Design a binder for this molecule. Sequence first.
Ligand SMILES: C[C@H](N)C(=O)NS(=O)(=O)OC[C@H]1O[C@@H](n2cnc3c(N)ncnc32)[C@H](O)[C@@H]1O
Ligand SMILES: C[C@H](N)C(=O)NS(=O)(=O)OC[C@H]1O[C@@H](n2cnc3c(N)ncnc32)[C@H](O)[C@@H]1O
Ligand SMILES: [Mg+2]
Ligand SMILES: [Mg+2]
Ligand SMILES: [Zn+2]
Ligand SMILES: [Zn+2]
Lengths: 463, 463
Amino acid sequence: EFSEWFHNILEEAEIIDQRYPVKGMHVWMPHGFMIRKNTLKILRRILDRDHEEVLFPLLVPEDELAKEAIHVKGFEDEVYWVTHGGLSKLQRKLALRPTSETVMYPMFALWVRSHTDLPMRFYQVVNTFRYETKHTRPLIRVREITTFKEAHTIHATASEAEEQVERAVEIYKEFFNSLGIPYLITRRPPWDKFPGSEYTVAFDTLMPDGKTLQIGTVHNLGQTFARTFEIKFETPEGDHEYVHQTCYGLSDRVIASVIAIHGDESGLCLPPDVAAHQVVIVPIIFKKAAEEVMEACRELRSRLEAAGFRVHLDDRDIRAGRKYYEWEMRGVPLRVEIGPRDLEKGAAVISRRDTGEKVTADLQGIEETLRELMKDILENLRTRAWERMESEIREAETLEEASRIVDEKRGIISFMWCGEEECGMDVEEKVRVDILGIQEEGSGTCINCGREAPYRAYLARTY
Amino acid sequence: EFSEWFHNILEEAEIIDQRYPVKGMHVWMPHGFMIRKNTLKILRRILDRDHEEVLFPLLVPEDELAKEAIHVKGFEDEVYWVTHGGLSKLQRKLALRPTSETVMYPMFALWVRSHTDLPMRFYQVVNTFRYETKHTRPLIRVREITTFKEAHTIHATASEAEEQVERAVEIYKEFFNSLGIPYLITRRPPWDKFPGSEYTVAFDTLMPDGKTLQIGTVHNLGQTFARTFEIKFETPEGDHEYVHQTCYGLSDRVIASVIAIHGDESGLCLPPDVAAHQVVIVPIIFKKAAEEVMEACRELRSRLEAAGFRVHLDDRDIRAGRKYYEWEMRGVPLRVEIGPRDLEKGAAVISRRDTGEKVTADLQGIEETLRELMKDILENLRTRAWERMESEIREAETLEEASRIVDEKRGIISFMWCGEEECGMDVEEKVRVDILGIQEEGSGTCINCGREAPYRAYLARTY
Ligand SMILES: C[C@H](N)C(=O)NS(=O)(=O)OC[C@H]1O[C@@H](n2cnc3c(N)ncnc32)[C@H](O)[C@@H]1O
Ligand SMILES: C[C@H](N)C(=O)NS(=O)(=O)OC[C@H]1O[C@@H](n2cnc3c(N)ncnc32)[C@H](O)[C@@H]1O
Ligand SMILES: [Mg+2]
Ligand SMILES: [Mg+2]
Ligand SMILES: [Zn+2]
Ligand SMILES: [Zn+2]
């Protein structure tokens, strides 16, 4: 049910066109692009406080890419390879970046010398490629991840690296909260962690189809990559130790989530700061003081723009009904309607997209009325969202109880787990599900082997 | 001389790092990235008035790419090819886009149906690839063009297409004027035009080494591509005719130009709206009312930010001299110095980067003082630039006179030309130079074959 909804809204709202001759690679149409644009503004506003945006190459030579032990193994048959340059065969294969560690790190080896240099915090929003699962899914599982934001940090002590991991987590919380997206933060099992990292922390959110979606990861690379690429730095004493690194990233999935989570029967419903337009002015006219209604709207649009609004006056010549539908299925938060009546009173009608509540305000201070309304809509959408999610995280004491809940209600399954490889795999297999990760807390007994359970774990059917 | 200057400023100002294991592919460091960022804001501000930004895939399948007659021939051995997906060999080669016609057009075939649909004006800023000349050059001739803005338009009548070509030209003029970049607009010879187009209009600018640099092209594709990809549309009568297309684009070269053209002995000198910072506040302190000098600067920074300035307070603990040098070689337009004296008078010192003029203004209305100063700097830089260029465009009546001027003074050579293939080639060969293009005007006699010369032509040593 959700799948069809998603696929249809992506087309109707003209977010992306999937009809491209190469599977797993979609086109961002105008509207979709605007949403992607605003989602990124929000993200960069946060990241730019303490991170420096950069832009590295797309292609990586075998030599560099394979310098990894586990990392190369982690993307082996997952990389695309350019082998020829025209008709000529390159004397050194070039791989399309799947992620940029093997691209930036050898360069970091150069950029880093003195402890005065550290800490360095970089990031970029580029396109990465991954040859995977025959199962392609829009904005969720693509071959060309068009909105891959990857951050990489460098530190002097392993201490600061961990502190960074915590900072990243706070950055994503803030990012997501702005999108009104709820999430569950856990620590991935050591066999799911980023290839070569010390550990991986992941953010997972729940899709309307009861399935979970990883929408962000933070990895603590310790000094593994440092040693691999020789990234050393001089201490104030005169020694040469390897740096401590961490990296984290999001993808188009964030945009899928926003669409999906605040999804709706009417179409898209988006946080005001993500929508292509925050306020769409629709003048109501039947050839009765039209010249006056119009100039009332125009004046309003201009007035809103100067106040910093992303407004749009829909003066097309069609039935206001059709207009309402359009901007509604597209996700515009506020609709401002103006007609002879209201006009001849100094007021207008403001309709909400999340609720439906049409209220009446004075065109005199409307700017503030709108600003407030917007703050309200986010909080509501964010709240609703959190409720909906938490109400799907259910505890289980028996592996049997789990299988029953998952299969009947889907969602997330909370449970105490011993945290052992074999036990975990066994849990996954028996329940045909994936262990999202753990959360250290009070002990108990592993839902499976009954032994001592140091961790609170979650599992679910994932994307 | 210029070359070394360029290469050194790119490194000293930390614009791009060229030390990447793959030739023709550079890294944008923080500072460089900020300039690229602002240059693009300026560009998008213009383009977004009537164009819709989008984002198509990177990879193109042989099938589509080769659908062209001359176009495929035009990029034959110029394309990179991904042949394997992991260890598996794809059953259909994928080419990294060199430009996106073969990517967007088949999609346009779908997006276009009714004349009500046209006109459509799209554009994107993506990374394109081109396997060319062994001679790699930063921001000028790269294998991975990291800042390729390509616009594509669709029209109902060939009439509107031409009108579009004129619009594009006006858009680039405005874009360039904002960067204070001078240019010569001409019509490329029919053997240099974009592969498959009706004709190509190009913008060329002059580099400090007397060589010319193509910094923009607008192509009128007529219905050539329409027929190739079956892009038809329904007329109000009910007929089905092919659409009229045009496309135009710029690259990182625009950023090279800005750096190079307003180049300088002190380092970078950039248009206020391109610099990483428009105003850098440097407090002068020697342990004498410091606490008061500082709070005077801070207050100023905040005050400037709220006014919309990209300001930066350099409160580092170093000699103000070293600070001046840094922000000066980096291109910051205005430096605001504050010390005990000036402070205890309600005024500060404002130094210009283009001139050097340090003036004294009242911290009371300084915002407007600065805004004005900025407008002044652009106009100056733009003017200087135009003078410098026009003073290098020299007329020649004899093929011999040309060879003498080119070889001794470089620059552009104006001349009357018959406009014939063989005659043109002959001119180029004999003078070891390239014919930039023509400009229809009063007749005369071809500098070479003496026959009737319908066009005013230019030639020079190019990049
Ligand atoms: C930051 C680290 N270098 C990185 O690459 N981590 S990652 O491999 O976990 O990817 C980061 C995020 O990208 C998203 N992602 C991964 N593969 C994807 C795919 N094929 N399609 C869409 N999003 C994907 C997920 O939300 C994931 O959390
Ligand atoms: C718009 C059309 N589809 C296009 O591709 N035209 S073009 O091939 O002429 O390229 C547009 C512009 O990109 C720049 N350009 C072309 N090849 C380049 C290269 N190898 N490195 C840097 N800039 C390049 C030039 O300034 C040129 O005017
Ligand atoms: Mg698992
Ligand atoms: Mg030529
Ligand atoms: Zn167990
Ligand atoms: Zn001639």
